[PDB]
Amino acid sequence: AHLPKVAQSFLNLLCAQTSLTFSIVVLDEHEVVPVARSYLPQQDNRVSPYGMHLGNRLPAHATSTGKVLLSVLDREVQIEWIEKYGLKRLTPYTITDEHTFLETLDAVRQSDYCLSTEEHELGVIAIAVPVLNAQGLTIAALNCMSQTNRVQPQYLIDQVLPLLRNTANELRNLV
Numbered sequence: 253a254h255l256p257k258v259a260q261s262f263l264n265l266l267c268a269q270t271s272l273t274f275s276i277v278v279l280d281e282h283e284v285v286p287v288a289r290s291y292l293p294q295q296d297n298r299v300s301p302y303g304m305h306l307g308n309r310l311p312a313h314a315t316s317t318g319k320v321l322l323s324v325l326d327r328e329v330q331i332e333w334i335e336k337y338g339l340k341r342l343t344p345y346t347i348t349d350e351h352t353f354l355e356t357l358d359a360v361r362q363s364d365y366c367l368s369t370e371e372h373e374l375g376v377i378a379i380a381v382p383v384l385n386a387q388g389l390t391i392a393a394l395n396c397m398s399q400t401n402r403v404q405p406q407y408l409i410d411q412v413l414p415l416l417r418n419t420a421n422e423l424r425n426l427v
């Protein structure tokens with residue numbers, strides 16, 4: 253896929269609303285790649301953690317995005333994926349057990365969102381949702397990253413998640 257241009261407007265929309273950082277993320281093998289991000293120069297600075305700036309590749313098993321994108325696959329394909337690349341711990345909170353990681357991916361499947369709190373880098377939080385195409389294929393993930401000292405976990409649940417779901421929903425018809 254190569255359609256990050258029409259999405260740039262929705263992301264700035266979500267940021268001007270909430271002062272946070274939104275992105276579209278693509279799964280490549282075992283790392284996930286940001287392909288668009290919300291940028292408003294009048295209020296956002298250009299210094300950002302690992303992966304909040306566009307370009308950087310992060311491991312799938314520690315990001316809210318990456319866990320969302322693995323939940324779609326079948327269980328045996330997930331298993332064959334955890335076998336290949338493994339789960340290297342990065343913070344005191346990374347999911348490194350296998351039975352635990354499968355039961356998360358099944359819960360992110362059923363529930364359609366993933367909140368990951370400090371599971372890749374200390375002081376960073378994110379909520380992600382799947383972004384589908386017309387055919388219903390999961391094609392990317394849309395996520396909201398911030399620092400745990402500025403945003404509380406239920407604001408992400410109570411407020412961001414509704415907006416996230418509306419925005420994913422209106423992309424579906426355009427991609």
Ligand SMILES: O=C(O)c1cccc(O)c1
Nearest residue numbers: 303315316317372373378
């Ligand atoms: O959970 C994420 O998608 C995420 C995004 C950026 C940095 C990070 O540590 C995690």
